[PDB]
């Protein structure tokens, strides 16, 4: 304060598509060209997490108001709901015949 400058850059290897920060300001998720989602710690960028098995690149990432569930919708016709505690999924979900562009949450509950 109103102008913009950079603190850091992140040197990656893939064609970045969506990046989302936690509303709890803890987690920073990143989609890549690979079937991978990297969730970073906010404060020191420690590479907390990586995800696999999606076969097509992630088109939008959500996480909850309280950082519990990750949703990484991609062009592979399905939604894979990742649990944010231990980096596993709870349930994958085939839907939306063509390819899934954007997903967003409700701030009240997991809907």
């Amino acid at each position: 304060v109103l102008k913009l400058h950079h603190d850091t850059t992140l040197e990656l290897t893939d064609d970045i598509l969506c990046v989302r920060v936690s509303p709890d300001d803890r987690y920073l998720a990143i989609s890549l060209l690979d079937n991978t989602v990297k969730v970073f710690f906010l404060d020191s960028m420690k590479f907390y997490l990586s995800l696999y098995g999606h076969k097509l690149p992630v088109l939008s990432i959500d996480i909850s108001f309280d950082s519990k569930m990750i949703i990484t919708s991609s062009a592979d016709k399905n939604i894979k709901i990742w649990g944010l505690d231990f980096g596993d999924c709870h349930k994958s979900l085939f839907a939306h015949q063509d390819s899934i562009m954007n997903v967003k949450f409700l701030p009240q509950s997991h809907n």
């Binding site: 420690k46 907390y48 995800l51 696999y52 505690d85 231990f86 980096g87 596993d88």
Partner: protein, 360 residues
């Protein structure tokens, strides 16, 4: 009801040493200064385990739950399944059985069901590569511990299968007056319900810390998925240094935390390995009470064991004050002649011990 111990400290140790001796004990004032005084649930659950393996043992709990009476019966054993309560891991239940494992009337084929790791108690990998090798040196040859299903906190659902077939008359008289020279460092990294990449990341951290040491370092990468992996996700690593010539193994372990860095935990346990080795002489600090007992209940003969003063803590003395209250065996400690270190030789005349129960 003649030997009396105070306090809930080393409670599963005191049931063991009464059982091998056959001297009845009465442990009173267990957790008397609590808002919920008395035993815990698992300490009651462990007393059901001794009943299942020994016919004739009488176990009495007062209605305040702080006084436990135990007149031991003979070790029968056989095959059965024990359910482990979710407070303490299945490995914790396994450790007391190993002390009475070579002496039963029959084979121990005991099936354990529950959570298979924690912060405090022994993981499956630690028992297999730490407790089992010590048993083999004494003379317990056909001893094993199989893994059926691996669990993890908080739900677990894992299964191990303790199978001990060597039924010997006494542990042989061990003489180890030489610090064993570590040949190789071997560790097992496991993970359930989570990414295979995390296990690879854990291995990278441990190798980097141990890169300076010149020895072959191989960590088995074990990945578990599906129903066999278990109800709750989690991971852990167990690292084992070993000496081929004397068959002596040293280990350290830990599991993953709610949000832990797998680069750090692979680096941490390898530090906890080398910290354990730096305090060690011919055992570990967590292998020493298994071997102190086996010199005592070995036959009527002097054994020798080269141990280090860093192992000797407050915890080590309470081990030697539980033996003297049961077996009345003073453990003579002599200095070594090597002036570079403070090793001492622990010499024990073993009490003359047999198998009451084995048939001829």
């Amino acid at each position: 009801k003649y030997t009396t111990f105070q306090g809930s400290q080393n409670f599963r140790l005191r049931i063991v040493l009464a059982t091998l001796s056959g001297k009845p004990i009465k442990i009173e004032k267990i957790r008397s200064g609590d808002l919920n005084p008395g035993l815990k649930d698992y300490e009651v659950s462990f007393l059901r385990l001794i009943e299942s393996v020994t016919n004739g043992s009488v176990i009495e709990i007062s209605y305040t739950g702080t006084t436990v009476i135990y007149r031991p019966g003979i070790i029968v054993g056989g095959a059965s399944t024990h359910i482990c309560p979710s407070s303490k891991p299945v490995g914790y239940f396994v450790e007391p059985m190993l002390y009475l494992a070579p002496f039963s009337k029959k084979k121990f084929s005991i099936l354990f069901k529950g959570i298979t790791a924690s912060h405090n108690d022994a993981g499956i990998e630690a028992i297999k590569w730490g407790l089992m090798p010590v048993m083999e040196k004494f003379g317990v040859r056909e001893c094993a511990l199989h893994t059926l299903k691996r669990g993890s906190p908080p739900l677990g659902g894992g299964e191990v299968h303790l199978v001990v077939d060597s039924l010997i008359a006494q542990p042989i008289t061990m003489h180890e007056i030489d610090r064993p020279i570590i040949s190789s460092i071997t560790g097992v990294a496991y993970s359930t319900r989570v990414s295979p990449s995390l296990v690879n990341r854990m291995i990278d951290g441990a190798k980097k810390v141990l890169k300076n040491l010149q020895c072959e370092v191989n960590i088995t990468a074990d990945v578990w998925r599906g129903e066999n992996s278990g109800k709750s996700p989690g991971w852990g690593i167990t690292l084992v240094a070993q000496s081929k010539q004397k068959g002596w193994s040293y280990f350290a372990e830990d599991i993953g935390d709610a949000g832990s860095i797998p680069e750090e935990l692979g680096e941490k346990v390898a530090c906890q390995l080398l910290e354990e080795i730096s305090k060690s002489a011919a055992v570990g600090r967590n292998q020493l009470p298994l071997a102190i007992v086996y010199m005592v209940i070995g036959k009527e003969d002097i054994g020798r064991l080269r141990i280090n003063k860093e192992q000797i803590d407050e915890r080590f003395i309470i081990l030697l004050r539980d033996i003297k209250k049961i077996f009345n065996t003073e453990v003579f400690l002599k200095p070594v002649d090597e002036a570079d270190n403070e090793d001492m030789i622990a010499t024990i005349k073993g009490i003359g011990f047999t198998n009451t129960s084995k048939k001829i």
